[PDB]
Amino acid sequence: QLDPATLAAFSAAFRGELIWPSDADYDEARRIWNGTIDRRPALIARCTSTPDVVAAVSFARKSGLLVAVRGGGHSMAGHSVCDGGIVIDLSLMNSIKVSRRLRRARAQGGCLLGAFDTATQAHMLATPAGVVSHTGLGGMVLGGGFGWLSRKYGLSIDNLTSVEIVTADGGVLTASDTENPDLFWAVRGGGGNFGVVTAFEFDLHRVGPVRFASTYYSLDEGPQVIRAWRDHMATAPDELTWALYLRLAPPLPELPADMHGKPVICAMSCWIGDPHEGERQLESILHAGKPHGLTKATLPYRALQAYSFPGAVVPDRIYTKSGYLNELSDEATDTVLEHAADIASPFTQLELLYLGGAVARVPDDATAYPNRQSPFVTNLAAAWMDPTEDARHTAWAREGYRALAGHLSGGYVNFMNPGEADRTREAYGAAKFERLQGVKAKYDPTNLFRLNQNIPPS
């Protein structure tokens, strides 16, 4: 229940659409990618411009409404919808302006990654981002953003040159390396904690065809494959990216039918560079076990981005446990394989990513992103359909994480689950957390923006 004159001012300033609990499209509009999050906002505000976002931020502040901000809706913690507050929904703000000559993209805060990649790839350009096309640019970038171009070109934030952001007081600011640089440091890794980013500006790279391979190894050869991977990646050129996704084999025709539904290692790899050299490089890492269901192709970068994940199934419910590693020992490898063998849903993956490369050459305190120096990421990404099965899949992720606890440190804020609100200090570390609290105290002293991996002020 809201103050009528304040609501009137808000509606008058707001050119976008307002979705109320009684409108037919409220239920669909309040659903986010993590279907285990069922929440009922008081109001959904579909913003169409920066002044729309200003109006919405101001209205939430005057009304005392809990603020959720939504880009693409992919929050693994469920942060983009609230019970009883306002959803500042940016999904209609999807435009990208690309300069081919200047190698620049200016993208609104509601963009979906596939819209961005399409727009830059019209000119054979790109900048690093995540591997699934319908992820939102917004939350991803603000937490760091990594994927197929990161070992070559860094995190998304390593290519961000400025933002336009609406702060909790209703003001609009530009943050860059030369203008409000403390805020610029903080948004590069600090999440939505300091305001609503309504435009991101990135430097772009020329990225022609990329030689790519995806294949599946039997878990019988699991030890030799994973050891080959971790050995190789410690000295591999930045141009090679090679990731392992332990999962049940999808029922696709390139795979023998007797392997369908059984745990396997799906290995995906690419070479950012000359495709003839890439072919040589990928053949050099494809044979540590027998590759089943091998697909090799020379792909436009936009098609590489659109390819993940084999099977093309969107799961309804998810639960993720994740952390970094500094090393992947033989015993950690057996633990990984032991829990991979117990995967139950065909949409679960136990992901082993190797970052390093350009990501680790950025000095640690240049941004708010922690753990550049830990090259391994393990993500126990449980995903399933049946709501009566939540406990069994959640358990797989939780137990696997616990079993590897001796090897795991830190944690990517963008892979954190709904129950992980207190992993924040550990993820960032004490020095970064303290600096972030100081920027929080300057720019969001009332913690208006607290549906995120939250950094309280002071």
Ligand X SMILES: Cc1cc2nc3c(=O)[nH]c(=O)nc-3n(C[C@H](O)[C@H](O)[C@H](O)COP(=O)(O)OP(=O)(O)OC[C@H]3O[C@@H](n4cnc5c(N)ncnc54)[C@H](O)[C@@H]3O)c2cc1C
**Residues in contact with a copy of itself by the rule CB under 8 A:** 15, 25, 28, 48-49, 91-97, 99-101, 110, 112-115, 117-119, 121-124, 133-134, 208-209, 211, 252-254, 275-276, 278-279, 295-303, 305-307, 310-314
Can you tell me whether residue 436 is helix, strand or coil?
Answer: helix
User: With respect to a copy of itself, which residue has the nearer C-beta, 255 or 448?
Assistant: 255
Task: Single out the segment in contact with ligand X by CB under 6 A; choices: 73-81, 168-176, 178-186, 233-241.
Answer: 73-81
Does 139 participate in binding ligand X (rule CB under 6 A)? yes
User: Among residue numbers 175 through 214, which ones bind ligand X (CB under 6 A)?
Assistant: 191-192, 196-197
Task: Single out the segment in contact with ligand X by CB under 6 A; choices: 14-22, 65-73, 264-272, 277-285.
Answer: 65-73
Determine which helix (DSSP H) or strand (DSSP E) holds 141, and give its type and residue range: helix 137-143
Does 142 participate in binding ligand X (rule CB under 6 A)? yes
Closest CA to 315 of 249, 393, 383: 383
User: Among residue numbers 400 through 429, which ones bind ligand X (CB under 6 A)?
Assistant: 414
- Cβ atoms of 306 and 401 within 8 Å: the answer is no
For tokens 């072919």, what's the residue?
279
Can you tell me whether residue 271 is helix, strand or coil?
Answer: strand
CB of 333 to ligand X, least distance (A): 23
CB of 130 to ligand X, least distance (A): 3
Residue 399, by phi and psi: left (phi above 0), alpha (psi -120 to 50) or beta? alpha
User: With respect to ligand X, which residue has the nearer C-beta, 157 or 343?
Assistant: 157
Amino acid at 9: A
- Cβ atoms of 113 and 128 within 8 Å: the answer is no
- Cβ atoms of 284 and 242 within 8 Å: the answer is no
Query: Phi and psi dihedrals of 144, rounded to 5?
Result: 140, -65
Q: What is the DSSP letter of 202?
A: E
Question: Residue 124: which of ligand X, a copy of itself, none does it interact with, CB under 5 to 8 A by kind?
Answer: a copy of itself
- Give the C-alpha separation, 373 to 203, whole Å: 23
CB of 208 to ligand X, least distance (A): 16
CB of 110 to ligand X, least distance (A): 7
CB of 167 to a copy of itself, least distance (A): 22
CB of 423 to ligand X, least distance (A): 14
Q: What is the CA radius of gyration of the chain?
A: 22
Question: Residue 143: which of a copy of itself, ligand X, none does it interact with, CB under 5 to 8 A by kind?
Answer: ligand X
Question: Residue 138: which of ligand X, a copy of itself, none does it interact with, CB under 5 to 8 A by kind?
Answer: ligand X
Closest CA to 156 of 183, 197, 189: 189
Closest CA to 301 of 381, 379, 205, 198: 205
User: With respect to a copy of itself, which residue has the nearer C-beta, 122 or 366?
Assistant: 122
Can you tell me whether residue 95 is helix, strand or coil?
Answer: coil
Question: Residue 366: which of a copy of itself, ligand X, none does it interact with, CB under 5 to 8 A by kind?
Answer: none
Does 138 participate in binding ligand X (rule CB under 6 A)? yes
Does 143 participate in binding ligand X (rule CB under 6 A)? yes
Question: Residue 101: which of ligand X, a copy of itself, none does it interact with, CB under 5 to 8 A by kind?
Answer: a copy of itself
CB of 65 to a copy of itself, least distance (A): 23
User: With respect to ligand X, which residue has the nearer C-beta, 250 or 289?
Assistant: 250
- Cβ atoms of 449 and 192 within 8 Å: the answer is yes
| Vertex 69 angle, CA 64 and 71, to 5° | 165
User: With respect to ligand X, which residue has the nearer C-beta, 65 or 288?
Assistant: 65
- Cβ atoms of 381 and 323 within 8 Å: the answer is no
Question: Residue 79: which of a copy of itself, ligand X, none does it interact with, CB under 5 to 8 A by kind?
Answer: ligand X
Which burial class, exposed, middle or buried, applies to 387 when counting CB atoms under 10 A from its CB (0-12, 13-18, 19+)? exposed
Q: Which two tokens stand for residue 437?
A: 């609290």
Which of 16, 35, 85, 145 touches ligand X by CB under 6 A?
145
- Sketch the per residue contact string, 18 through 47, with ligand X: x for CB under 6 A, - otherwise: --------------xx--------------
Question: Residue 190: which of a copy of itself, ligand X, none does it interact with, CB under 5 to 8 A by kind?
Answer: none
- Give the C-alpha separation, 125 to 206, whole Å: 4
- Cβ atoms of 82 and 68 within 8 Å: the answer is yes
Which burial class, exposed, middle or buried, applies to 145 when counting CB atoms under 10 A from its CB (0-12, 13-18, 19+)? buried
User: With respect to ligand X, which residue has the nearer C-beta, 73 or 323?
Assistant: 73
- Cβ atoms of 400 and 323 within 8 Å: the answer is no
User: With respect to a copy of itself, which residue has the nearer C-beta, 120 or 453?
Assistant: 120
User: With respect to a copy of itself, which residue has the nearer C-beta, 12 or 430?
Assistant: 12
- Cβ atoms of 152 and 134 within 8 Å: the answer is no
Q: Which residues contribute to the site for ligand X (CB under 6 A)?
A: 32-33, 69-76, 79-80, 90, 109, 130-132, 135-136, 138-140, 142-143, 145-147, 191-192, 196-197, 414, 451-452
